[PDB]
Design a protein around this ligand. Structure first.
Ligand SMILES: *[C@@H]1O[C@H](CO)[C@@H](O[C@@H]2O[C@H](CO)[C@@H](O[C@@H]3O[C@H](CO[C@H]4O[C@H](CO[C@H]5O[C@H](CO)[C@@H](O)[C@H](O)[C@@H]5O)[C@@H](O)[C@H](O[C@H]5O[C@H](CO)[C@@H](O)[C@H](O)[C@@H]5O)[C@@H]4O)[C@@H](O)[C@H](O[C@H]4O[C@H](CO)[C@@H](O)[C@H](O)[C@@H]4O)[C@@H]3O)[C@H](O)[C@H]2NC(C)=O)[C@H](O)[C@H]1NC(C)=O
Ligand SMILES: *[C@@H]1O[C@H](CO)[C@@H](O[C@@H]2O[C@H](CO)[C@@H](O[C@@H]3O[C@H](CO[C@H]4O[C@H](CO[C@H]5O[C@H](CO)[C@@H](O)[C@H](O)[C@@H]5O)[C@@H](O)[C@H](O[C@H]5O[C@H](CO)[C@@H](O)[C@H](O)[C@@H]5O)[C@@H]4O)[C@@H](O)[C@H](O[C@H]4O[C@H](CO)[C@@H](O)[C@H](O)[C@@H]4O)[C@@H]3O)[C@H](O)[C@H]2NC(C)=O)[C@H](O)[C@H]1NC(C)=O
Ligand SMILES: *[C@@H]1O[C@H](CO)[C@@H](O[C@@H]2O[C@H](CO)[C@@H](O[C@@H]3O[C@H](CO)[C@@H](O)[C@H](O)[C@@H]3O)[C@H](O)[C@H]2NC(C)=O)[C@H](O)[C@H]1NC(C)=O
Ligand SMILES: *[C@@H]1O[C@H](CO)[C@@H](O[C@@H]2O[C@H](CO)[C@@H](O)[C@H](O)[C@H]2NC(C)=O)[C@H](O)[C@H]1NC(C)=O
Ligand SMILES: *[C@@H]1O[C@H](CO)[C@@H](O[C@@H]2O[C@H](CO)[C@@H](O)[C@H](O)[C@H]2NC(C)=O)[C@H](O)[C@H]1NC(C)=O
Ligand SMILES: *[C@@H]1O[C@H](CO)[C@@H](O)[C@H](O)[C@H]1NC(C)=O
Ligand SMILES: *[C@@H]1O[C@H](CO)[C@@H](O)[C@H](O)[C@H]1NC(C)=O
Ligand SMILES: *[C@@H]1O[C@H](CO)[C@@H](O)[C@H](O)[C@H]1NC(C)=O
Ligand SMILES: *[C@@H]1O[C@H](CO)[C@@H](O)[C@H](O)[C@H]1NC(C)=O
Ligand SMILES: *[C@@H]1O[C@H](CO)[C@@H](O)[C@H](O)[C@H]1NC(C)=O
Ligand SMILES: *[C@@H]1O[C@H](CO)[C@@H](O)[C@H](O)[C@H]1NC(C)=O
Ligand SMILES: *[C@@H]1O[C@H](CO)[C@@H](O)[C@H](O)[C@H]1NC(C)=O
Ligand SMILES: *[C@@H]1O[C@H](CO)[C@@H](O)[C@H](O)[C@H]1NC(C)=O
Ligand SMILES: *[C@@H]1O[C@H](CO)[C@@H](O)[C@H](O)[C@H]1NC(C)=O
Ligand SMILES: *[C@@H]1O[C@H](CO)[C@@H](O)[C@H](O)[C@H]1NC(C)=O
Ligand SMILES: *[C@@H]1O[C@H](CO)[C@@H](O)[C@H](O)[C@H]1NC(C)=O
Ligand SMILES: *[C@@H]1O[C@H](CO)[C@@H](O)[C@H](O)[C@H]1NC(C)=O
Ligand SMILES: *[C@@H]1O[C@H](CO)[C@@H](O)[C@H](O)[C@H]1NC(C)=O
Ligand SMILES: *[C@@H]1O[C@H](CO)[C@@H](O)[C@H](O)[C@H]1NC(C)=O
Lengths: 436, 123, 132, 120, 436, 28
């Protein structure tokens, strides 16, 4: 006989709209963080976790929809933030550029026509080489030919903050606490939580910054280790500390581009010109690669491993591309990953102001100067690597060569968010009994 | 809200207490008032669906003649074609998750039978 | 779905089982079909309206004490000034539609009397009975 | 929402009517039928969703107390005079009923669950 | 014993949307007036109102959120209505003016934005002196140095209609239906209404037009008489009729300035040129003075009462800002507020087209001209006055002085919304008894 | 939305028009 039971502890897989949560920092410095929609609820103090005894669940990081949701949420926020900011199309006029290490910074003069009086106003600004394209040595800004360039708004910070994702009511998040989970498969010691740990939405292309660490060992995860087209996510158990700076003592200039809007550029640089170099401890870096190679030897045929440099000619793939303060650094990492494992480090960088962020082509973002001497530091917590594989040669190599890889920027989140799965609760069902 | 891996007997024992927490409100007290353009429309959609789920469960239980109750004995006999297992093993070897999966393909049928047999009660 | 060309008496003989199909239709099935500002906001508004209408009817059955009932009898007498017809004309010659139209003008009076008596005067009587 | 007797409707006379309970969950339907531009439209829709949500929360609480089918519900909970008291004639002949809110919101705020959990 | 009841008539302060209302007037071609966009069904004839016996409530009008809601409704509606209209920035170019009532009207020549087809064309338009700023006779529009000036759409009416506010389900509006209420505290004849009376959203600085009239006699309703930094909102008995004219016969030109962008301006004045003016006649407002006399004891003890002049120096505050048609008048109120008491007249008016509405610096509205010969009349129903603050004297003055003052548009509506308070209904509660 | 100079190619059913481009990128 059928008996109906309501309040039954059963869940099924589901995908839903997720909620944010954040610390109520309330800085109130008249600078809003772009993450202004992150405060839909304060971070729950004393969050709980309940272990479910004898529950086995299948987790799949490669198909994880929370990763896909995070991507949509970050893009949406960026577009909303930049939407109302000043267009820089009045600056697509022909530039007359001369030098100010040689040729890295150029002094460009131009005729701007949007001055209120509707008569030409001569103006000048300093620009970094990466934003200037040749077109007799005349120049134009690199993205004017294809898209609208907008200036990021003053008083909006884009500093990453920890953000916790929370289940909507009626849903729950299951967390995988198994050790050496690795991927695509059963996990024991599954617990239920309301909110995830905080994840800092830090964007980079090669070396993952300010993430979580593996608890016991370096862990290497991949959807498929024989499919040479897949990205291998490597999580470290110790952070490698990286420092970086852009020492030029920049002084900012402001151009009256439109009645209600100002355009900001570097006006002049005081003192000497130096490269925006980064500093990695040699010992920690070398030991980290040693450990990665060891774990790769266990995963792959136990043969010699080598790490090689970036491939391709695309700056967003070949260089690190991290956001430090208000600047975009494009650091040369070929200094790293130049060794074979068979058993300070200075990285030069460039500064670029016009960014094809998220590889969209409708618009580009412009980064204003931040008055010189910018210093930051961060934790290297993991790497995005690919194996080169190769053509079907007749056993011509006993060494597996790996290289830094980048693009997509989804693994930046997947590497931490993979422990979480979303399910829905459907507390209604029936069972046999002795009845009417 | 644990004991998910426990047997059906163990989990349904004192189902009511567990159920009161699950059913304290979908959102408990409007997300315990803690939470009191596109972001807005997505949240309205989420809130509306939560309301519909609540009402659908209450409506279906009401149709079946189960109201103000969590556990109801109905007029529909168990058909062994849905499942033919010892009463004891489903209750003390199987968990609720395993059970719901085991008879997932009979959900529409059982529910339809319950509506017809429970509606035909003179009223 | 129904007939309604039938008389009140005939139509209502199956109310026990015709009801609980109309009720079901309000919440179930359509909402599975729909799992997919032109056709955006409008669908959200449609969902909200359906919920509001549903709750109104349930609230009135509740206020009148017909909780979970399809057919319920209460203590309010019929006022013969309304549809001053024999019982048979009302139940066997007229259809439900015709009937609702004839007494549409007394709906407010009927509903107010039902609220005053059922679950109102009746519950003050119950509070008194439970004092002991 | 006539609220006749909202102040000093004895207290007991207020209870012979209780007719304003049919407004918060119903008049909104009438307002929408009369109506039958996102600048006003989203806010108005949010108001409709909230009105429904508030209605349901009260119904859920009455359900937990075992009062969902009643307009007047006597529960098996003694009144606690350490929170507030006066004679019953004053309570039933002179309505305000706000003096009770700080204390009751915690006393019955908790008891609704304790009562049902330990009811039998 | 605890008994719970669910139809308990109690309430608490709350805020919400107030829907909208209109009288369902036919749109009459043109466009629906912007106020007619409030597509809410007119409050049913004979709106419901219920008097609540024994009800005491505190109607503190100075904290009434309906004022803020009306404020937001007007700002928002105006921006949505002006948003898609023609931008006039191509007209910020230098003009050559020939000065043709003391040079108030100028004839100004355009050198650049003169033709839609490519041509070095010359073009002319007439302007009022108040909108023209000197830069030989070289002039530009007054707000171009900082703002974006848009033309209001020539087809759109912003003319006020009465608007009623209504409560959402779960809410009620409490009406202070009493006599001589002073703006705060009890008024123990409170009724509940489904909606408010209609209020026209008229904005007019110093003299409030088309409001409700005082019942019985004049009331003062200040927030605090001993606080010098406060507005006194006076509601007048009966009413005063004012007749405003701009006695000039115009013509219209339409200049194609940019593709699809037409500038609507004044062509020529037919017949003689005459100064705009408003007529008030032999108004004896001595009963206002007597209400002051009642409150005179608080306002520096019993003193002579004077209203000798409007000051502060800013025409937006100093002059009466009046909307007659599609055009705005600035009238000198010095001829009314000149006399002192012991205890036809005309206001010359200026005409202005570029309006810095609500001091939203960075934006401005251009009012295209009317066809010609505009005459209108309106009712003076109240005044916004301030008292000179007390000076650092030896308490020797025998006279107090009041002046027309204002500019904060919210005080225009505090005068009508003072009777209403919004509360939400909380039907669930308990009381002690003796039962099960 | 600029001036066209049209020369054609029933006769002038299809107009062959010389067009001055409002410049899209370089403002030249
Ligand atoms: C990139 O930049 C960073 C700076 O931003 C720079 O960081 C330095 O890195 C080195 C190498 O890792 C660190 O050196 C180690 O320090 C260990 C001790 O750390 C503690 O004590 C420090 C001493 O100062 C305290 O005590 C004195 C005396 O009483 C007092 O005056 C001081 O005021 C202070 O109280 C202290 O500074 C340090 O605190 C920093 O670090 C913590 C943790 O990150 C942080 O929370 C703090 O806010 C602060 O930044 C901490 O309290 C020491 O044990 C260790 O010794 C090893 O070697 C010896 C042999 O020589 C072995 O015997 C031993 O077992 C260890 O193996 C070593 O000396 C240094 O402290 C960092 N400096 C700072 C300011 O953080 C990176 O190097 C830069 N990288 C590159 C590539 O350039
Ligand atoms: C601003 O402009 C307005 C015009 O827009 C102007 O208004 C006039 O103001 C004067 C002074 O206050 C008013 O004069 C008073 O009129 C009283 C009589 O009113 C009645 O009769 C009027 C005339 O009747 C003739 O026409 C009608 C036409 O239909 C015909 O049947 C009759 O047989 C007769 O031939 C009539 O117009 C008026 O109508 C009202 O209703 C219409 C509705 O549409 C409205 O449009 C009107 O404006 C008006 O409200 C009504 O039927 C008269 O009793 C009064 O005299 C006594 O009081 C004075 C007080 O000072 C004492 O001194 C005197 O001894 C008496 O005791 C006085 O004569 C005049 O009616 C106004 N309207 C018009 C059109 O002229 C403002 O003054 C201007 N203000 C400024 C500052 O410039
Ligand atoms: C890189 O990784 C290291 C190691 O996890 C991070 O160090 C940690 O920094 C936090 C914040 O300063 C320390 O927490 C504080 O500890 C003190 C007690 O000493 C307590 O009083 C404070 O309230 C707070 O809890 C934490 O102890 C420290 N961890 C260790 C092992 O020392 C470092 O911050 C990371 N770098 C970046 C850029 O994220
Ligand atoms: C307050 O409301 C009551 C009705 O609810 C008004 O009527 C009197 O109420 C008192 C107290 O219950 C009775 O003793 C009288 O007999 C009632 N009057 C009549 C004619 O029956 C009361 O007047 C109202 N008070 C105020 C100040 O408004
Ligand atoms: C100015 O006030 C007058 C008088 O109150 C308004 O005119 C009349 O108002 C009474 C109500 O007091 C109505 O019964 C009449 O039908 C109204 N007559 C007309 C012709 O409107 C008048 O509308 C107010 N406003 C203006 C601009 O004059
Ligand atoms: C259930 O839990 C026990 C105790 O940890 C363990 O020995 C057993 O293997 C588990 N069984 C399953 C199916 O997970
Ligand atoms: C560019 O600038 C140099 C001076 O740095 C000047 O001599 C040259 O004529 C300029 N060229 C143009 C095209 O303006
Ligand atoms: C003109 O072109 C020649 C050849 O490429 C180059 O050397 C010279 O510097 C150019 N002129 C300028 C002003 O750059
Ligand atoms: C399961 O996760 C909890 C998290 O608090 C941890 O304390 C416990 O040791 C874990 N158990 C196993 C077997 O991993
Ligand atoms: C990381 O793993 C290696 C290899 O197992 C181990 O030697 C090292 O101590 C671990 N690091 C930390 C910080 O535990
Ligand atoms: C850039 O060149 C211009 C001349 O065209 C000069 O006036 C200006 O000072 C130079 N900028 C800097 C920062 O030296
Ligand atoms: C790093 O510098 C070397 C210098 O020899 C250069 O060959 C290499 O291409 C640079 N890499 C990147 C990513 O710029
Ligand atoms: C990287 O590849 C080049 C290919 O020419 C090879 O010569 C070099 O030795 C490789 N380096 C490492 C570390 O494998
Ligand atoms: C301004 O207009 C007068 C008209 O008499 C003309 O003589 C004068 O040359 C004009 N000035 C300019 C700068 O166009
Ligand atoms: C301004 O004056 C000139 C003559 O100097 C005349 O041709 C032109 O039409 C006038 N413009 C306007 C707008 O009246
Ligand atoms: C220009 O105008 C000024 C008055 O503002 C006058 O004094 C001066 O003589 C005029 N100059 C010419 C050339 O007309
Ligand atoms: C209360 O308001 C009503 C409706 O306007 C009025 O008839 C009644 O006289 C007022 N009562 C008092 C005491 O003012
Ligand atoms: C108004 O009175 C002040 C003194 O309080 C005096 O300075 C001013 O000149 C007077 N203005 C007029 C128009 O009488
Ligand atoms: C259109 O006219 C241009 C000259 O303006 C000519 O070069 C072109 O070939 C013509 N197009 C066609 C299809 O004939």
């Amino acid at each position: 006989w059928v008996t109906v039971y309501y309040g039954v502890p059963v869940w099924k897989e589901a995908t839903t709209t997720l909620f944010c949560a954040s610390d109520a920092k309330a800085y109130d410095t008249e600078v809003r963080n772009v993450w202004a929609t992150h405060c839909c609820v304060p971070t729950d103090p004393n969050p709980q976790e309940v272990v479910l005894e004898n529950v086995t669940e299948n987790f799949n990081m490669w198909k994880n929809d929370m990763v896909e949701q995070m991507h949509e949420d970050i893009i949406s926020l960026w577009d909303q933030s930049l939407k109302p900011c000043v267009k820089l199309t009045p600056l697509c006029v022909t530039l007359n550029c001369t030098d100010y290490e040689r040729g890295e910074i150029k002094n460009c003069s131009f005729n701007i026509t949007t001055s209120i009086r509707d008569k030409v106003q001569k103006e000048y600004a300093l620009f970094y080489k990466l934003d200037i394209v040749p077109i007799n040595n005349s120049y134009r800004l690199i993205n004017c030919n294809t898209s609208v360039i907008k200036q990021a708004c003053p008083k909006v910070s884009f500093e990453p903050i920890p953000i916790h994702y929370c289940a909507p009511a009626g849903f729950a998040i299951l967390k995988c606490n198994d050790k050496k989970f690795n991927g695509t498969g059963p996990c024991t010691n599954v617990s239920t939580v309301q909110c995830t740990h905080g994840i800092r939405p830090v964007v980079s292309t090669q070396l993952l910054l300010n993430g979580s660490l593996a608890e016991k060992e370096v862990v290497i995860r991949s959807q498929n280790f024989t499919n040479n087209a897949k990205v291998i996510i490597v999580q470290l158990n110790e952070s490698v500390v990286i420092n970086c700076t852009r020492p030029n003592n920049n002084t900012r200039k402001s151009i009256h581009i439109a009645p209600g809007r100002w355009f900001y550029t570097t006006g002049a640089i005081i003192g000497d010109i130096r490269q925006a170099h980064c500093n990695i401890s040699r010992v920690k870096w070398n030991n980290t690669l040693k450990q990665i190679a060891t774990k790769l030897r266990e995963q792959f045929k136990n043969k010699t491993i080598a790490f090689n440099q970036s491939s391709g000619g695309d700056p967003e793939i070949v260089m690190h591309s991290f956001n430090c303060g208000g600047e975009f650094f494009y650091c040369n990492t070929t200094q790293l990953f130049n060794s074979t494992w068979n058993d300070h480090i200075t990285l030069p960088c460039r500064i670029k102001q016009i960014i094809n962020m998220w590889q969209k082509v409708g618009k580009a973002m412009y980064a204003p100067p931040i008055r010189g001497q910018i210093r930051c530091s961060s934790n290297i917590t993991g790497l995005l690597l690919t194996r080169d594989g190769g053509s079907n040669e007749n056993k011509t190599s006993e060494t597996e060569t790996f290289r830094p890889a980048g693009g997509d920027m989804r693994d930046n989140w997947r590497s931490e968010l993979y422990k979480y799965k979303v399910v829905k609760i459907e507390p209604l069902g029936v069972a046999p009994t002795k009845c009417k | 809200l644990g004991a998910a891996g426990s047997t059906m007997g163990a989990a349904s024992m004192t189902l009511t207490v567990q159920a009161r927490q699950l059913l304290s409100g979908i959102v408990q007290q409007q997300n315990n008032l803690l939470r009191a353009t596109v972001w807005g429309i997505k949240q309205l959609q989420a809130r509306v669906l939560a309301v519909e789920r609540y009402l659908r469960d209450q409506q279906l239980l009401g149709i079946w003649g189960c109201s103000g109750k969590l556990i109801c004995c109905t007029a529909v006999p168990w058909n062994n074609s849905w499942s033919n297992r010892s009463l004891d093993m489903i209750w003390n070897n199987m968990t609720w998750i395993e059970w719901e999966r085991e008879i997932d393909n009979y959900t529409g049928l059982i529910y339809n039978l319950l509506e017809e047999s429970q509606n035909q009660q003179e009223k």
